[PDB]
Write an enzyme that holds these catalytic residues in place. Structure first.
Site, PDB file in Angstrom:
ATOM      1  N   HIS A  58       0.822  -1.215   0.000  1.00  0.00           N
ATOM      2  CA  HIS A  58       0.000   0.000   0.000  1.00  0.00           C
ATOM      3  C   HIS A  58       0.859   1.271   0.000  1.00  0.00           C
TER       4      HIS A  58
ATOM      5  N   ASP B 221       5.728  21.910 -26.609  1.00  0.00           N
ATOM      6  CA  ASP B 221       5.976  20.561 -26.084  1.00  0.00           C
ATOM      7  C   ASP B 221       7.108  20.658 -25.059  1.00  0.00           C
TER       8      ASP B 221
ATOM      9  N   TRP C 250       7.237   0.836   4.158  1.00  0.00           N
ATOM     10  CA  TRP C 250       7.540   1.516   2.890  1.00  0.00           C
ATOM     11  C   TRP C 250       8.913   2.202   2.879  1.00  0.00           C
TER      12      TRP C 250
ATOM     13  N   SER D 287      12.488   7.518 -13.576  1.00  0.00           N
ATOM     14  CA  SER D 287      11.309   8.149 -14.176  1.00  0.00           C
ATOM     15  C   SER D 287      11.101   9.588 -13.691  1.00  0.00           C
ATOM     16  N   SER D 288      11.139   9.778 -12.377  1.00  0.00           N
ATOM     17  CA  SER D 288      10.958  11.086 -11.769  1.00  0.00           C
ATOM     18  C   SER D 288      12.069  12.062 -12.152  1.00  0.00           C
TER      19      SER D 288
ATOM     20  N   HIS E  21      11.594  13.409   3.680  1.00  0.00           N
ATOM     21  CA  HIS E  21      10.867  14.639   3.799  1.00  0.00           C
ATOM     22  C   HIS E  21      10.555  15.362   2.459  1.00  0.00           C
TER      23      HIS E  21
ATOM     24  N   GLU F  50      10.169  14.200  -0.372  1.00  0.00           N
ATOM     25  CA  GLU F  50       9.139  13.346  -0.973  1.00  0.00           C
ATOM     26  C   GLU F  50       7.694  13.813  -0.687  1.00  0.00           C
TER      27      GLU F  50
ATOM     28  N   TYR G 126       6.637  16.858   0.195  1.00  0.00           N
ATOM     29  CA  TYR G 126       6.400  18.162  -0.433  1.00  0.00           C
ATOM     30  C   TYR G 126       6.319  17.999  -1.955  1.00  0.00           C
TER      31      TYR G 126
ATOM     32  N   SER H 232      -4.884  26.625  -6.235  1.00  0.00           N
ATOM     33  CA  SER H 232      -4.817  28.044  -6.602  1.00  0.00           C
ATOM     34  C   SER H 232      -5.596  28.398  -7.876  1.00  0.00           C
TER      35      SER H 232
ATOM     36  N   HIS I  85      13.061  14.901  12.293  1.00  0.00           N
ATOM     37  CA  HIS I  85      11.859  14.829  13.129  1.00  0.00           C
ATOM     38  C   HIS I  85      11.086  13.527  12.884  1.00  0.00           C
ATOM     39  N   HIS I  86      11.516  12.766  11.884  1.00  0.00           N
ATOM     40  CA  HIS I  86      11.070  11.399  11.694  1.00  0.00           C
ATOM     41  C   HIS I  86      11.919  10.411  12.507  1.00  0.00           C
TER      42      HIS I  86
ATOM     43  N   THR J 201       3.900  27.295   5.241  1.00  0.00           N
ATOM     44  CA  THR J 201       3.000  26.216   4.839  1.00  0.00           C
ATOM     45  C   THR J 201       1.576  26.543   5.247  1.00  0.00           C
TER      46      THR J 201
ATOM     47  N   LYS K 137      -0.452  29.623   3.608  1.00  0.00           N
ATOM     48  CA  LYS K 137      -1.139  29.463   2.316  1.00  0.00           C
ATOM     49  C   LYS K 137      -2.652  29.265   2.447  1.00  0.00           C
TER      50      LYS K 137
ATOM     51  N   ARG L  30       1.498   1.518  15.003  1.00  0.00           N
ATOM     52  CA  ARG L  30       1.497   1.325  13.560  1.00  0.00           C
ATOM     53  C   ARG L  30       1.960  -0.075  13.220  1.00  0.00           C
TER      54      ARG L  30
HETATM   55  C1  HEA Z   1       1.701  16.859   2.560  1.00  0.00           C
HETATM   56  C2  HEA Z   1       2.797  16.426   3.172  1.00  0.00           C
HETATM   57  C3  HEA Z   1       2.978  16.813   4.633  1.00  0.00           C
HETATM   58  C4  HEA Z   1       2.879  18.051   5.178  1.00  0.00           C
HETATM   59  C5  HEA Z   1       2.572  19.394   4.477  1.00  0.00           C
HETATM   60  C6  HEA Z   1       3.123  17.931   6.597  1.00  0.00           C
HETATM   61  C7  HEA Z   1       3.109  18.936   7.555  1.00  0.00           C
HETATM   62  C8  HEA Z   1       3.695  18.928   8.817  1.00  0.00           C
HETATM   63  N1  HEA Z   1       4.201  17.810   9.469  1.00  0.00           N
HETATM   64 FE1  HEA Z   1       4.197  15.850   8.656  1.00  0.00          FE
HETATM   65  N2  HEA Z   1       4.223  13.935   7.853  1.00  0.00           N
HETATM   66  C9  HEA Z   1       3.920  13.568   6.551  1.00  0.00           C
HETATM   67  C10 HEA Z   1       3.475  14.465   5.564  1.00  0.00           C
HETATM   68  C11 HEA Z   1       3.296  15.851   5.673  1.00  0.00           C
HETATM   69  N3  HEA Z   1       3.363  16.597   6.826  1.00  0.00           N
HETATM   70  C12 HEA Z   1       4.174  12.126   6.451  1.00  0.00           C
HETATM   71  C13 HEA Z   1       3.958  11.266   5.180  1.00  0.00           C
HETATM   72  C14 HEA Z   1       4.613  11.677   7.654  1.00  0.00           C
HETATM   73  C15 HEA Z   1       4.996  10.252   8.139  1.00  0.00           C
HETATM   74  C16 HEA Z   1       5.580   9.276   7.124  1.00  0.00           C
HETATM   75  C17 HEA Z   1       5.731   7.880   7.733  1.00  0.00           C
HETATM   76  O1  HEA Z   1       6.227   7.737   8.877  1.00  0.00           O
HETATM   77  O2  HEA Z   1       5.357   6.895   7.063  1.00  0.00           O
HETATM   78  C18 HEA Z   1       4.655  12.805   8.561  1.00  0.00           C
HETATM   79  C19 HEA Z   1       5.066  12.764   9.889  1.00  0.00           C
HETATM   80  C20 HEA Z   1       5.439  13.842  10.686  1.00  0.00           C
HETATM   81  C21 HEA Z   1       6.300  13.841  11.852  1.00  0.00           C
HETATM   82  C22 HEA Z   1       6.983  12.601  12.436  1.00  0.00           C
HETATM   83  C23 HEA Z   1       5.925  11.939  13.322  1.00  0.00           C
HETATM   84  C24 HEA Z   1       6.357  10.568  13.816  1.00  0.00           C
HETATM   85  O3  HEA Z   1       6.600   9.650  12.987  1.00  0.00           O
HETATM   86  O4  HEA Z   1       6.449  10.396  15.064  1.00  0.00           O
HETATM   87  C25 HEA Z   1       6.369  15.100  12.328  1.00  0.00           C
HETATM   88  C26 HEA Z   1       7.166  15.572  13.509  1.00  0.00           C
HETATM   89  O5  HEA Z   1       7.617  16.707  13.520  1.00  0.00           O
HETATM   90  C27 HEA Z   1       5.562  15.967  11.489  1.00  0.00           C
HETATM   91  C28 HEA Z   1       5.352  17.339  11.607  1.00  0.00           C
HETATM   92  C29 HEA Z   1       4.730  18.191  10.686  1.00  0.00           C
HETATM   93  C30 HEA Z   1       4.504  19.624  10.809  1.00  0.00           C
HETATM   94  C31 HEA Z   1       4.905  20.505  12.008  1.00  0.00           C
HETATM   95  C32 HEA Z   1       3.878  20.064   9.708  1.00  0.00           C
HETATM   96  C33 HEA Z   1       3.546  21.559   9.398  1.00  0.00           C
HETATM   97  O6  HEA Z   1       4.355  21.952   8.291  1.00  0.00           O
HETATM   98  C34 HEA Z   1       2.062  21.814   9.081  1.00  0.00           C
HETATM   99  C35 HEA Z   1       1.727  23.309   8.878  1.00  0.00           C
HETATM  100  C36 HEA Z   1       0.484  23.612   9.679  1.00  0.00           C
HETATM  101  C37 HEA Z   1      -0.751  23.706   9.166  1.00  0.00           C
HETATM  102  C38 HEA Z   1      -1.024  23.516   7.703  1.00  0.00           C
HETATM  103  C39 HEA Z   1      -1.885  23.985  10.128  1.00  0.00           C
HETATM  104  C40 HEA Z   1      -2.767  25.175   9.734  1.00  0.00           C
HETATM  105  C41 HEA Z   1      -2.025  26.461  10.037  1.00  0.00           C
HETATM  106  C42 HEA Z   1      -2.544  27.664   9.743  1.00  0.00           C
HETATM  107  C43 HEA Z   1      -3.903  27.761   9.099  1.00  0.00           C
HETATM  108  C44 HEA Z   1      -1.785  28.940  10.045  1.00  0.00           C
HETATM  109  C45 HEA Z   1      -0.339  28.711  10.511  1.00  0.00           C
HETATM  110  C46 HEA Z   1      -0.342  28.633  12.027  1.00  0.00           C
HETATM  111  C47 HEA Z   1       0.631  28.034  12.740  1.00  0.00           C
HETATM  112  C48 HEA Z   1       1.813  27.389  12.077  1.00  0.00           C
HETATM  113  C49 HEA Z   1       0.538  28.021  14.236  1.00  0.00           C
HETATM  114  N4  HEA Z   1       5.026  15.151  10.520  1.00  0.00           N
HETATM  115  C1  HEA Z   2      -0.846   9.438  -0.998  1.00  0.00           C
HETATM  116  C2  HEA Z   2      -0.589   8.409  -0.188  1.00  0.00           C
HETATM  117  C3  HEA Z   2      -1.654   7.513   0.493  1.00  0.00           C
HETATM  118  C4  HEA Z   2      -2.961   7.378   0.229  1.00  0.00           C
HETATM  119  C5  HEA Z   2      -3.780   8.107  -0.859  1.00  0.00           C
HETATM  120  C6  HEA Z   2      -3.508   6.408   1.168  1.00  0.00           C
HETATM  121  C7  HEA Z   2      -4.815   5.994   1.214  1.00  0.00           C
HETATM  122  C8  HEA Z   2      -5.343   5.227   2.220  1.00  0.00           C
HETATM  123  N1  HEA Z   2      -4.654   4.716   3.313  1.00  0.00           N
HETATM  124 FE1  HEA Z   2      -2.709   4.776   3.578  1.00  0.00          FE
HETATM  125  N2  HEA Z   2      -0.780   4.907   3.938  1.00  0.00           N
HETATM  126  C9  HEA Z   2       0.171   5.568   3.170  1.00  0.00           C
HETATM  127  C10 HEA Z   2      -0.098   6.439   2.137  1.00  0.00           C
HETATM  128  C11 HEA Z   2      -1.351   6.619   1.600  1.00  0.00           C
HETATM  129  N3  HEA Z   2      -2.504   5.946   2.005  1.00  0.00           N
HETATM  130  C12 HEA Z   2       1.494   5.238   3.654  1.00  0.00           C
HETATM  131  C13 HEA Z   2       2.818   5.787   3.064  1.00  0.00           C
HETATM  132  C14 HEA Z   2       1.356   4.404   4.688  1.00  0.00           C
HETATM  133  C15 HEA Z   2       2.481   3.753   5.538  1.00  0.00           C
HETATM  134  C16 HEA Z   2       2.807   2.339   5.069  1.00  0.00           C
HETATM  135  C17 HEA Z   2       3.804   1.679   6.031  1.00  0.00           C
HETATM  136  O1  HEA Z   2       3.426   1.433   7.188  1.00  0.00           O
HETATM  137  O2  HEA Z   2       4.963   1.380   5.662  1.00  0.00           O
HETATM  138  C18 HEA Z   2      -0.059   4.177   4.878  1.00  0.00           C
HETATM  139  C19 HEA Z   2      -0.588   3.395   5.867  1.00  0.00           C
HETATM  140  C20 HEA Z   2      -1.936   3.229   6.060  1.00  0.00           C
HETATM  141  C21 HEA Z   2      -2.525   2.642   7.237  1.00  0.00           C
HETATM  142  C22 HEA Z   2      -1.775   2.121   8.476  1.00  0.00           C
HETATM  143  C23 HEA Z   2      -1.239   0.702   8.249  1.00  0.00           C
HETATM  144  C24 HEA Z   2      -0.516   0.155   9.473  1.00  0.00           C
HETATM  145  O3  HEA Z   2       0.136   0.917  10.229  1.00  0.00           O
HETATM  146  O4  HEA Z   2      -0.603  -1.071   9.707  1.00  0.00           O
HETATM  147  C25 HEA Z   2      -3.835   2.621   7.061  1.00  0.00           C
HETATM  148  C26 HEA Z   2      -4.817   2.094   8.077  1.00  0.00           C
HETATM  149  O5  HEA Z   2      -6.016   2.045   7.878  1.00  0.00           O
HETATM  150  C27 HEA Z   2      -4.122   3.215   5.767  1.00  0.00           C
HETATM  151  C28 HEA Z   2      -5.374   3.368   5.233  1.00  0.00           C
HETATM  152  C29 HEA Z   2      -5.605   4.041   4.063  1.00  0.00           C
HETATM  153  C30 HEA Z   2      -6.896   4.146   3.430  1.00  0.00           C
HETATM  154  C31 HEA Z   2      -8.203   3.514   3.962  1.00  0.00           C
HETATM  155  C32 HEA Z   2      -6.728   4.848   2.314  1.00  0.00           C
HETATM  156  C33 HEA Z   2      -7.797   5.218   1.260  1.00  0.00           C
HETATM  157  O6  HEA Z   2      -8.628   4.091   1.007  1.00  0.00           O
HETATM  158  C34 HEA Z   2      -8.629   6.419   1.746  1.00  0.00           C
HETATM  159  C35 HEA Z   2      -9.795   6.689   0.784  1.00  0.00           C
HETATM  160  C36 HEA Z   2      -9.302   7.364  -0.482  1.00  0.00           C
HETATM  161  C37 HEA Z   2      -9.721   7.054  -1.719  1.00  0.00           C
HETATM  162  C38 HEA Z   2     -10.738   5.974  -1.983  1.00  0.00           C
HETATM  163  C39 HEA Z   2      -9.159   7.868  -2.868  1.00  0.00           C
HETATM  164  C40 HEA Z   2      -8.089   7.125  -3.660  1.00  0.00           C
HETATM  165  C41 HEA Z   2      -7.639   7.937  -4.866  1.00  0.00           C
HETATM  166  C42 HEA Z   2      -6.367   7.889  -5.305  1.00  0.00           C
HETATM  167  C43 HEA Z   2      -5.343   7.026  -4.605  1.00  0.00           C
HETATM  168  C44 HEA Z   2      -5.945   8.699  -6.519  1.00  0.00           C
HETATM  169  C45 HEA Z   2      -5.849   7.743  -7.730  1.00  0.00           C
HETATM  170  C46 HEA Z   2      -5.343   8.482  -8.969  1.00  0.00           C
HETATM  171  C47 HEA Z   2      -6.157   9.035  -9.904  1.00  0.00           C
HETATM  172  C48 HEA Z   2      -7.658   8.984  -9.806  1.00  0.00           C
HETATM  173  C49 HEA Z   2      -5.570   9.729 -11.099  1.00  0.00           C
HETATM  174  N4  HEA Z   2      -2.940   3.585   5.146  1.00  0.00           N
HETATM  175  C1  CYN Z   3       6.219  16.020   7.713  1.00  0.00           C
HETATM  176  N1  CYN Z   3       7.328  15.704   7.784  1.00  0.00           N
HETATM  177 CU   CU1 Z   4       8.874  15.045   7.057  1.00  0.00          CU
END
Ligand code: HEA
Ligand code: HEA
Ligand code: CYN
Ligand code: CU1
Ligand code: DMU
Ligand code: DMU
Ligand code: DMU
Ligand code: DMU
Ligand code: DMU
Ligand code: DMU
Ligand code: TRD
Ligand code: TRD
Ligand code: TRD
Ligand code: TRD
Ligand code: TRD
Ligand code: TRD
Ligand code: CA
Ligand code: CU1
Ligand code: CU1
Ligand code: MG
Lengths: 535, 256
Positions: free
Chosen positions: A86, A116, A156, A184-185, A268, A270, A272, A283, A317-318, A343, A346, A465
């Site tokens: 997944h 193009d 993953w 590819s990317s 990280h 990845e 963004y 936008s 922070h991961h 972030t 926006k 998890r």
């Molecule tokens: C779209 C991608 C995305 C984005 C944008 C963010 C946004 C942020 N993430 Fe996230 N994060 C992930 C994707 C993302 N994350 C993924 C995939 C993982 C785990 C992957 C894995 O383990 O498998 C993860 C996990 C993760 C961790 C590790 C957790 C753990 O494994 O224990 C942490 C810790 O610092 C963190 C922090 C943050 C913070 C502080 C923000 C901030 O940048 C968010 C900004 C805040 C907002 C958008 C809130 C709304 C704010 C306003 C409206 C106004 C601004 C006000 C203030 C800032 C006070 N994230």
């Molecule tokens: C973009 C990334 C993405 C997306 C879309 C999803 C989608 C979903 N994820 Fe996923 N998830 C991950 C990224 C994502 N996940 C990752 C990285 C992990 C960690 C794996 C690991 O532990 O190593 C994870 C882990 C994870 C867990 C925890 C597993 C565990 O710890 O044991 C669970 C639990 O329920 C979960 C559930 C779901 C569900 C129910 C959906 C969806 O079913 C929610 C419903 C959404 C839809 C039905 C829309 C789907 C549409 C698309 C995907 C776009 C397709 C493209 C076009 C149409 C052009 N996911």
């Molecule tokens: C979010 N890292």
């Molecule tokens: Cu990160």
């Protein structure tokens, strides 16, 4: 209709990426349904060791019907394989190919007035590398793997020594798949950057380029820095497994934590890379349906650039519980809080864009507004997680799962749907039925919230998890989460019906611009669909 | 002993606190929660208001502004203020958490696939700790009559399945426990939610955590880094007891 795959035109390549991303997306969503079937109730009912004694086909169908606990020997390996499958499909073979490879290839050249991409033959190759990588990822699932079964149960992110000690060659296939994705990317990014810099229209200054084209450009730079780093990390795993190295093996003087630094240095960026093109789409959509130009165009560009740059200095922070010193934890905490500002800001700009406008609540606008809500809910829990002392409790729990599904998974998905409804008329010459678009939105929006909001409660209650099964006290919110997933899945099947309907018998599009005057970028001055050769 | 450190049915909050560090986490999280709930409600109400007030039927001619310097200044500074404030309360708590004090009791913990090994270096005690219902206790990681019987015999019930282990890490109440954590084969992670502690068990590294339990009872954790097939099946039981009961347990292990 096999001169589709040999085409070098950015529009044809865009379409192939979108369809392919959608199909892989369906496979990966199907995994989550099976996952949520097993998580719906405590005790293991579906992933029984007994199903292994049947055929691959017979075993498959037996595993979809629940057994009594007394008849079901829990198979943890299957759980681990599914979730790894997944995560890998989503992060490498679904959303980036849809957003960057799909909408990026289709629309960026149109937005900047380029006929193009700089290297059309290279663009075609990038697509085939995506497909080969996908095939290897899927093959790995059916290859000799851990515990004398098939597939890699390694997460993953492939942490060693687990990933380096997994038996069979399933894990080597997975590593090859990720090499092919990265290639590819990188080819894509080279094309996007060269096109953006060299092939803009006369008059098209850098401060006149549409935000979507900027989002793809910034994304492309992130790919060029991040993906080679990942390529190193995983080659080092491949050599530890096959060629006698001990980069991550203590017996040879290695450090598994080193892999984590290298992996997360890619990891990280990845996230963004995933969400930046969705920012571009949001936008364009909000400006169109609010009938109002984007609030603060230059701050939007600069925020994206700042996020792109700062995204390279927050990786650890991961790793707050991996053994980082107090000083390292404190630094990465600071840096993480900094990137949060541009972030989260926006969201205010997108609200300001709506403010004082003339709002039309068509399907694309609904996805964009849903995006604003979900990205906020996901963002704020990120804020919680950034505080290393509190992450001590949340790390490797379902609270993290809730965070990234809200902020990233659903953010990317809502951006994808926003783009599809926005642009399907332009790409196909056929229009989607409005009532169905809205029904899709509401089923998805309700379903996604039911799926992921209760996972916050699971995390707070300490649910880890990557678990096939859980203590009985976690039952209520797992059940609700699973019902939400089943509703979301129903919405996605409905969506595929909507796309099929639209493409076969949807209302004929007659206008170049079927929205309004405030869709003001160049694709709206072309026909629907645009001519084989544009500009 | 009272079972305290456990999830409760339908729970939405933290597990109960049994250490000063856990208390600080609950307070800090509660503080941030108020703030983020405010942010979320604010943003939601703004979106909903904007959509009502500026709907095309109600506002037929759209505005054209793309700037508002005072607002852009306000909405940049306010987030910065919020984060500095959080960090002001947050950093001292992190320092308290990660500065390892002088130990009253020292336990060395080693993660294996799939069980925990405990060593008390001052006491020359070591033992292994398996899930009740793991292959080690005769099961296969599922509930059964035999497993329920073993849970009962060990002082638990059917409800502690997946949490309760055959042996517990025993420590005295109101004493500083320093745990040294490593992994033997792959990375595992040792945690007790009630104590506010978690530390990855990395092969080749020895990492330290500390807690001081403020009340007696039974407290569970679960392995928190994916480590293979029985990741879901290698939990942690800590029993916090009186100084005398701890001594008694120590003497029970002493070989003459
Ligand atoms: C779209 C991608 C995305 C984005 C944008 C963010 C946004 C942020 N993430 Fe996230 N994060 C992930 C994707 C993302 N994350 C993924 C995939 C993982 C785990 C992957 C894995 O383990 O498998 C993860 C996990 C993760 C961790 C590790 C957790 C753990 O494994 O224990 C942490 C810790 O610092 C963190 C922090 C943050 C913070 C502080 C923000 C901030 O940048 C968010 C900004 C805040 C907002 C958008 C809130 C709304 C704010 C306003 C409206 C106004 C601004 C006000 C203030 C800032 C006070 N994230
Ligand atoms: C973009 C990334 C993405 C997306 C879309 C999803 C989608 C979903 N994820 Fe996923 N998830 C991950 C990224 C994502 N996940 C990752 C990285 C992990 C960690 C794996 C690991 O532990 O190593 C994870 C882990 C994870 C867990 C925890 C597993 C565990 O710890 O044991 C669970 C639990 O329920 C979960 C559930 C779901 C569900 C129910 C959906 C969806 O079913 C929610 C419903 C959404 C839809 C039905 C829309 C789907 C549409 C698309 C995907 C776009 C397709 C493209 C076009 C149409 C052009 N996911
Ligand atoms: C979010 N890292
Ligand atoms: Cu990160
Ligand atoms: C549109 C998309 C739809 C996606 C498909 C969704 C299908 C999910 C239906 C699952 O069926 C349920 O599975 C439970 C197992 O999780 C069973 O629990 C019961 O039976 C089990 C034994 O099989 C026991 O162990 C449980 O405790 C007991 O509650 C229950 O009877 C059964 O009806
Ligand atoms: C599963 C996700 C689906 C994503 C939706 C993608 C929609 C784009 C379809 C575009 O197909 C176009 O059809 C036109 C004739 O109709 C062709 O002339 C054109 O060459 C082709 O490109
Ligand atoms: C596994 C996937 C799960 C699938 C679940 C989805 C259930 C679909 C409900 C079908 O009912 C539809 O309702 C529409 C909305 O009322 C009708 O449109 C009608 O009403 C609209 C007004 O709302 C008009 O715009 C249309 O022209 C008119 O056809 C449409 O005919 C009717 O068939
Ligand atoms: C698991 C998969 C689930 C299946 C999903 C299928 C979803 C797509 C269904 C589209 O529904 C169509 O919508 C049209 C547009 O709203 C309706 O046109 C109706 O409304 C038009 C607009 O008023 C009229 O001109 C037409 O004659 C009238 O038939 C049409 O009847 C209805 O069937
Ligand atoms: C952190 C919370 C985020 C929520 C975002 C939503 C709030 C947006 C409020 C925008 O405020 C408007 O800004 C305009 C531009 O600054 C002002 O126009 C003023 O200035 C214009 C010139 O730019 C003139 O055309 C107008 O006549 C004059 O009213 C107008 O008064 C003011 O109400
Ligand atoms: O800046 C840092 O801020 C810390 C506070 O956030 C200080 O820690 C001081 O204050 C903490 C208060 O919780 C104590 O735990 C530490 O022992 C003590 O050095 C520390 O010196 C100082 O460099
Ligand atoms: C006594 C058996 C209970 C019936 C449960 C039905 C399970 C339905 C699963 C089908 C899901 C296919 C995707
Ligand atoms: C956070 C999602 C916001 C979506 C708001 C939708 C408003 C209801 C629309 C009613 C139909 C009138 C066109
Ligand atoms: C133009 C017709 C409007 C169609 C809106 C459909 C609303 C359906 C909401 C259902 C909620 C799903 C759980
Ligand atoms: C107690 C709040 C229930 C939340 C349901 C998920 C939305
Ligand atoms: C804005 C999203 C935050 C998600 C956290 C929800 C937690 C609420 C439960 C608190 C119960 C404490 C007793
Ligand atoms: C005292 C903590 C400051 C961290 C805030 C960064 C913005
Ligand atoms: Ca189950
Ligand atoms: Cu483990
Ligand atoms: Cu584990
Ligand atoms: Mg971890």
């Amino acid at each position: 209709f096999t001169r589709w795959f040999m085409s070098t035109n950015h529009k044809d390549i865009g379409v192939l990426y979108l369809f392919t991303g959608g199909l892989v997306g369906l496979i990966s969503v199907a995994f989550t349904v099976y996952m949520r079937m097993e998580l719906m109730a405590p005790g293991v009912q579906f992933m029984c060791a007994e199903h292994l004694e049947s055929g691959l086909v017979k075993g498959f169908f037996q595993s979809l019907w629940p057994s009594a606990v007394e008849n079901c020997t829990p198979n943890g390996h299957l759980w681990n394989v599914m979730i790894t499958g997944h995560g890998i499909l989503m992060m490498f073979f679904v959303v980036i190919p849809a957003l960057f490879g799909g909408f990026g290839n289709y629309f960026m050249p149109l937005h900047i007035g380029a006929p193009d991409m700089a290297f059309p033959r290279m663009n075609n190759l990038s697509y085939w590398l995506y497909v080969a990588g996908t095939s290897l990822a899927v093959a790995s699932l059916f290859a000799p793997g851990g515990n004398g079964q098939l597939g890699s149960g390694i997460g993953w992110v492939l942490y060693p020594p687990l990933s380096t000690s997994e038996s069979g060659y399933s894990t080597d296939l997975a590593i090859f798949a990720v090499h092919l994705s990265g290639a590819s990317s990188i080819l894509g990014a080279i094309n996007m950057i060269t096109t953006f810099l060299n092939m803009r229209a006369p008059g098209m200054t850098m401060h006149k380029v549409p935000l979507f084209a900027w989002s793809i450009f910034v994304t492309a730079w992130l790919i060029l820095l991040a993906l080679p780093v990942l390529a190193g990390a995983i080659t080092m795993l491949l050599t530890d497994r096959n060629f006698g190295t001990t980069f991550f093996q203590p017996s040879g003087g290695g450090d598994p934590v080193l892999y984590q630094h290298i992996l997360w240095f890619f990891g990280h960026p990845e996230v963004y890379i995933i969400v930046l093109p969705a920012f571009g789409i949001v936008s364009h959509v909000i400006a169109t349906f609010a009938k109002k130009p984007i609030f603060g165009y230059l701050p939007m560009v600069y925020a994206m650039v700042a996020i792109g740059v700062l995204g390279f200095v927050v990786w650890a922070h991961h790793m707050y519980t991996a053994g980082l010193s107090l000083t390292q934890q404190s630094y990465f905490m600071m840096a993480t809080m900094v990137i949060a500002v541009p972030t989260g800001i926006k969201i205010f700009s997108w609200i300001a864009t709506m403010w004082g406008g003339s709002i039309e609540l068509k399907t694309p606008m609904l996805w964009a507004l849903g995006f604003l809500f979900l990205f906020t809910v996901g963002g704020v829990t990120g804020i919680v997680l950034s505080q290393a002392s509190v992450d001590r409790y949340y790390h490797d729990t379902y609270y993290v799962v809730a965070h990234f599904h809200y902020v990233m998974s659903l953010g990317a998905v809502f951006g994808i749907f926003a783009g599809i409804y926005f642009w399907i008329g332009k790409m196909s010459g056929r229009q989607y039925p409005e009532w169905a678009g809205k029904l899709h939105f509401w089923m998805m929006f309700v379903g996604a919230n039911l799926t992921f909001f209760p996972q916050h409660f699971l995390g707070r209650q300490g649910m880890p998890r990557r678990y096939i099964d859980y203590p009985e006290a976690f039952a209520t919110w797992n059940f609700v989460s699973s019902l939400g997933a089943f509703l979301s899945f129903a919405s996605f099947l409905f969506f595929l019906g909507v796309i099929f309907y639209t493409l076969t018998r949807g209302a004929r599009v007659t206008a170049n611009n079927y929205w309004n005057e405030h869709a003001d970028t160049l694709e709206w001055t072309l026909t629907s669909p645009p001519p084989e050769h544009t500009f | 002993l009272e079972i305290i450190g456990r999830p409760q049915p339908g729970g939405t909050g933290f597990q109960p606190s049994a250490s000063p560090v856990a208390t600080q986490i609950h307070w800090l999280d509660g503080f941030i929660l108020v703030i983020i709930a405010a942010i979320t409600i604010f943003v939601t109400l703004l979106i909903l208001y904007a959509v009502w007030r500026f709907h095309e039927k109600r506002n037929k001619v759209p505005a054209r502004f793309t700037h508002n310097s005072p607002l852009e200044i306000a909405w940049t500074i306010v987030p910065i203020v919020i984060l500095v404030a959080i960090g002001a309360f947050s950093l001292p708590v992190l320092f308290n958490q990660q500065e390892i004090p002088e130990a009253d009791v020292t336990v060395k913990v080693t993660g294996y696939q799939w069980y925990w090994g405990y060593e008390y270096p001052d006491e020359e005690i070591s033992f292994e700790s398996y899930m009740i219902g793991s292959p080690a206790t005769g099961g296969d990681n599922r509930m059964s009559p035999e497993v329920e019987q073993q849970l009962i015999e060990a002082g638990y019930s059917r409800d502690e399945f997946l949490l309760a282990t055959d042996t517990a890490m025993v420590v005295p109440v109101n004493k500083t426990v320093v745990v040294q954590v490593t992994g033997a084969d792959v990375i595992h992670s040792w945690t007790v939610p009630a104590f506010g502690v978690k530390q990855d068990a990395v092969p080749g590294r020895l990492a330290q955590l500390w807690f001081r339990a403020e009340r007696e009872g039974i407290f569970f954790g679960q392995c928190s880094e994916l480590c293979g097939i029985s990741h879901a099946y290698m939990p942690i039981t800590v029993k916090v007891v009186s100084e005398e009961a701890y001594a008694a347990w120590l003497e029970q292990h002493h070989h003459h």
